[PDB]
């Protein structure tokens, strides 16, 4: 008995035992802990080479277990019914807090308790950056450790006082520290290694904004190209069918195919096959989301419609036609602005983003200043038709309408397919 040592359970009695759910999952001790909670069976660990053990009687559990962990860590534990039998209080932390002067004052007081010296401008800029991290104009980030780290960096770069200038410098240096990838991308674009068109008009080409992997997910344009040729009614998405990934039927090819087939109705099947491809390979496209850029590129390729290369096109679209919101819109917009500034601002560049993302546009100071000067633009579109009429610079109503040109292109391609099938028939 004198050689029995107390673990965590034997010093949490009458109190609280706080464990990391990820730790229980990783160490494979969740079964033993569950038995200890239900049956009150605590048993000291033994050594395999010592055969003689001590039969420890069950011990009534008087402790309160408050696990703590990320939602993903519990998604591996809530499947067990005994978990929901034992743990019944869900203390969920909202990842975002309401963005209101009450919460701004609370954040200021909380950082003051941390020992930081905040000026009013510094607290205001920290609040703005919290909103930016939450990526919502109406919600501030509830990750108070992140804001504390940013405040520490601001204090170091500002002496001991978190002036507005100090915290602005801290945010700028935080962006600049992991900026090497985008710096190399801009140097490549300027040097001509990666050629992107940010002026003039082109057919079947668009600047689809994508995200690349990093500690901050950096947005950057990618030249999406669409080529339409007569053939089967199949939409070939080269990016997501590359290699052995083409055995999955995806959810985006079906979306665009349904939109194209239902929207333009003059034949019993789609008379074109459209290859959708990306120049360069850094894009990492999700297979379940069909971007608005793919739809507008396909429509331009069908109709020989010269789209503007000034405007980058981002946003998800469903088979109805309306544009869905996409994540990390701020990163994509800022990335396209960086590329445009590196190649020179013609005063007509811009981004086409869904109106549903209008509530997530928390943009940096530089982009907003460019918009105010009129050197940049931000376009909000509710349906893919609006994006197409913005890009092609013409309306879908009347003679020379966009829908009519698309119908003419489909009719010509169907005429070629008719000629091919007629020749093959005889």
């Amino acid at each position: 008995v004198s050689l029995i040592r107390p673990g965590a359970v034997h010093r949490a009695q009458g109190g609280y035992l706080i464990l990391d759910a990820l730790s229980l999952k990783r160490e494979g001790t969740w079964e033993a802990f569950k038995r200890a909670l239900r049956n009150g069976q605590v048993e000291p660990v033994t050594e395999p080479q010592a055969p003689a053990g001590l039969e420890v009687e069950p011990f009534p559990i008087q402790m309160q277990v408050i696990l703590v962990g990320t939602p993903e860590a519990f998604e591996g534990l809530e499947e067990d019914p005994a978990f929901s039998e034992l743990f019944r209080i869900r203390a969920e932390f909202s990842p975002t807090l309401p963005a209101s002067p009450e919460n701004c004052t609370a954040l200021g007081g909380w950082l003051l308790a941390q020992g930081f010296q905040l000026t009013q401008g510094g607290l205001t800029r920290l609040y703005d950056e919290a909103r930016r991290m939450a990526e919502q104009r109406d919600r501030m980030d509830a990750r108070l450790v992140e804001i504390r780290a940013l405040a520490e960096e601001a204090a170091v770069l500002g002496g001991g006082l978190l002036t507005a200038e100090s915290v602005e410098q801290a945010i700028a240096a935080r962006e600049h520290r992991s900026f090497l990838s985008e710096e190399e991308f801009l140097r490549a674009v300027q040097e001509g290694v990666i050629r992107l068109r940010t002026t003039g008009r082109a057919v079947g080409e668009v600047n689809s904004l994508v995200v690349v992997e990093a500690a901050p997910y950096w947005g950057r344009p990618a030249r999406l190209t669409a080529r339409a040729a007569p053939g089967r009614d199949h939409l070939i998405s080269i990016d997501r069918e590359a290699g052995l990934g083409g055995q999955i039927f995806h959810k985006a090819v079906l979306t665009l195919a349904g939109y194209l087939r239902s929207r333009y109705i003059e034949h019993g099947s789609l008379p074109v096959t459209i290859s959708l491809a990306f120049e360069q390979n850094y894009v990492s496209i999700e297979g379940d989301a069909a971007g608005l850029a793919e739809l507008v590129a396909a429509l331009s390729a069908i109709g020989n419609l010269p789209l503007r290369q000034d405007l980058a096109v981002t946003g998800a679209v469903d088979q109805t036609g309306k544009v869905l919101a996409v994540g990390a819109i701020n990163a994509k917009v800022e990335g396209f602005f960086r590329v445009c500034k590196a190649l020179g601002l013609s005063g007509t560049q811009g981004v086409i983003l869904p109106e549903a993302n209008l509530a997530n546009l928390t943009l940096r100071a530089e982009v907003l200043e460019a918009v105010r000067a009129g050197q940049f633009h931000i376009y909000a579109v509710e349906t893919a038709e609006q994006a197409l009429e913005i890009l092609a610079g013409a309306r879908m109503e009347g003679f020379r309408g966009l829908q009519e040109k698309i119908r003419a292109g489909l009719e010509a391609f169907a005429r070629l397919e008719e000629g091919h099938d007629k020749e093959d028939r005889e």
Partner: protein, 98 residues
């Protein structure tokens, strides 16, 4: 629809960069009324709870701060005793009786 600067402006205006602000500390779990209510219920009832939150929310530290101000009756002295040479049982005695 072209978004103007007014529609895109989201940065609250700044009145000064000096004159440091003094504010009282906020209550624990500020803006987290759900978590605070759940923890109050769990502590009052002695139920087994679990905090669920995205990483870097400082869930671990506010939990400690909220539990420190909590108070319960004095815990008993728990200890192993031999019921036999091979059988050992855990029992709790009143505080300071060990």
């Amino acid at each position: 629809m072209r978004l103007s600067y007014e529609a895109l402006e989201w940065r609250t205006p700044i009145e000064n960069s000096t004159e440091p602000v003094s504010l009282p500390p906020p209550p624990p779990f500020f803006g987290q009324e759900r978590a605070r209510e759940a923890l109050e219920l769990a502590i009052r009832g002695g139920f087994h709870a679990y905090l669920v939150g995205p990483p870097s929310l400082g869930k671990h530290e506010a939990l400690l701060a909220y539990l420190s101000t909590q108070s319960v009756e004095t815990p008993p002295d728990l200890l192993y005793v031999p019921l036999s040479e091979r059988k050992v049982a855990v029992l709790t005695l009143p505080s300071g009786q060990e």
